[PDB]
């Protein structure tokens, strides 16, 4: 394309990359919290399933 | 001649982007200094003086008319080129044909989003 | 060469149209909801 087409496309992709990096960071934080909260719920749910696999 | 004798005429230049090239060749072989993209300086004039003859005479001058439908050819849709922009700023309306619409099945490819016509309301039948 | 705010919709590529539609559908929905509420308020305030 022409120079302006390339410039606009490059700016758009740079914005997209910035946004995806930020979202990766947010998702990583939420993941850490989710694992932390998943351990106790893991034991709780496994216990609740205990009966059916035992009987 | 037709529009001056009370009749109506329609003229279709096809293309004007090749008249521009022929004019550039002439001007370069007469040794006149080139301009932008090597086109002479008088490349807007070339077309403006030509498309300004498509008038709509009043009833005192016969009432005849001469419509014009110049055809331009862009390069990969670069409407921003030199001759395309000149002729776009010369003409009244536009009819943008796009290859992405041609292959998507829309034929004629007229891009109704960008196509314009200054007359608009006027010059349309009441039912339409 | 840098990047600036509101550039995704300046390019007008696929992401630009995708974003425009993602906005328009949502706000058409909310406009419909608000119009329904406006009609309800109109009727309930006649008396």
Curated annotation (Swiss-Prot), chain A:
TM ranges: none
N6-succinyllysine modification, residue list: 24
Compartment(s) of residence: Mitochondrion inner membrane
Modified residues (N6-acetyllysine): 14, 30
Family in the record: Belongs to the ATPase gamma chain family.
Assembly and oligomerization: Component of the ATP synthase complex composed at least of ATP5F1A/subunit alpha, ATP5F1B/subunit beta, ATP5MC1/subunit c (homooctomer), MT-ATP6/subunit a, MT-ATP8/subunit 8, ATP5ME/subunit e, ATP5MF/subunit f, ATP5MG/subunit g, ATP5MK/subunit k, ATP5MJ/subunit j, ATP5F1C/subunit gamma, ATP5F1D/subunit delta, ATP5F1E/subunit epsilon, ATP5PF/subunit F6, ATP5PB/subunit b, ATP5PD/subunit d, ATP5PO/subunit OSCP.
Purpose: Subunit gamma, of the mitochondrial membrane ATP synthase complex (F(1)F(0) ATP synthase or Complex V) that produces ATP from ADP in the presence of a proton gradient across the membrane which is generated by electron transport complexes of the respiratory chain. ATP synthase complex consist of a soluble F(1) head domain - the catalytic core - and a membrane F(1) domain - the membrane proton channel. These two domains are linked by a central stalk rotating inside the F(1) region and a stationary peripheral stalk.
Annotated protein name in UniProt: ATP synthase F(1) complex subunit gamma, mitochondrial
Lineage: Eukaryota, Metazoa, Chordata, Craniata, Vertebrata
Name of encoding gene: ATP5F1C
From Swiss-Prot, chain B:
Binding site for Mg(2+): 14
Family: Belongs to the ATPase alpha/beta chains family.
Protein name, UniProt field: ATP synthase F(1) complex subunit alpha, mitochondrial
Site, Required for activity: residue positions: 115
Sequence positions bearing N6-acetyllysine: 7
Tissue: Heart muscle (at protein level). Heart and liver.
Note from the entry: The siderophore enterobactin (Ent) produced by enteric bacteria binds Fe(3+) and helps bacteria scavenge iron ions from the environment. As a consequence, the mammalian siderocalin LCN2 plays an important role in defense against bacterial infections by sequestering iron bound to microbial siderophores. LCN2 can also bind iron bound to endogenous or nutrient-derived iron chelators and plays an important role in cellular iron homeostasis.
Gene that encodes it: ATP5F1A
Domain of life: Eukaryota
Curated annotation (Swiss-Prot), chain C:
Alphabetic keyword roster: Coiled coil, Mitochondrion, Transit peptide
GO molecular function annotation: angiostatin binding; ATPase binding; ATPase inhibitor activity; calmodulin binding; identical protein binding; protein homodimerization activity; structural molecule activity
Impact upon substituting residue 35 to A: Impairs F(1)F(o)-ATP synthase-binding
One cellular component term from this protein's GO annotations in UniProt: cytoplasm
Origin: domain of life: Eukaryota
Predominant location category: mitochondrion
Subcellular location(s) per record: Mitochondrion
Site (Participates in pH sensing): 19, 42
Start and end residues of each stretch annotated as N-terminal inhibitory region: 1-20
Organism, as annotated: Bos taurus
Entry protein name: ATPase inhibitor, mitochondrial
Consequence when changing residue 25 to A: No effect on F(1)F(o)-ATP synthase-binding
Effect seen on changing residue 21 to V: Strongly impairs F(1)F(o)-ATP synthase-binding
From-to range in the entire protein, with total length: 33 to 79 of 109
Quaternary state and interactors: Homodimer; represents the active form and is present at a pH value below 6.5. Homotetramer; represents the inactive form and is present at a pH value above 7.0.
GO BP: erythrocyte differentiation; heme biosynthetic process; negative regulation of endothelial cell proliferation; negative regulation of hydrolase activity; negative regulation of mitochondrial ATP synthesis coupled proton transport; protein homotetramerization
Spans traversing the lipid bilayer: none
Source taxonomy: Eukaryota, Metazoa, Chordata, Craniata, Vertebrata
Entry keyword Transit peptide: yes
Similarity comment: family membership: Belongs to the ATPase inhibitor family.
Effect noted on mutating residue 37 to V: Strongly impairs F(1)F(o)-ATP synthase-binding
Domain notes: Forms an alpha-helical dimer with monomers associated via an antiparallel alpha-helical coiled coil composed of residues 74-106, leaving each N-terminal inhibitory region (residues 26-62) accessible for interaction with an F1 catalytic domain. The inhibitory N-terminal region (residues 26-62) binds the alpha(ADP-bound)-beta(ADP-bound) (ATP5F1A-ATP5F1B) interface of F1-ATPase, and also contact the central gamma subunit (ATP5F1C).
Start and end residues of each stretch annotated as Disordered: 1-20
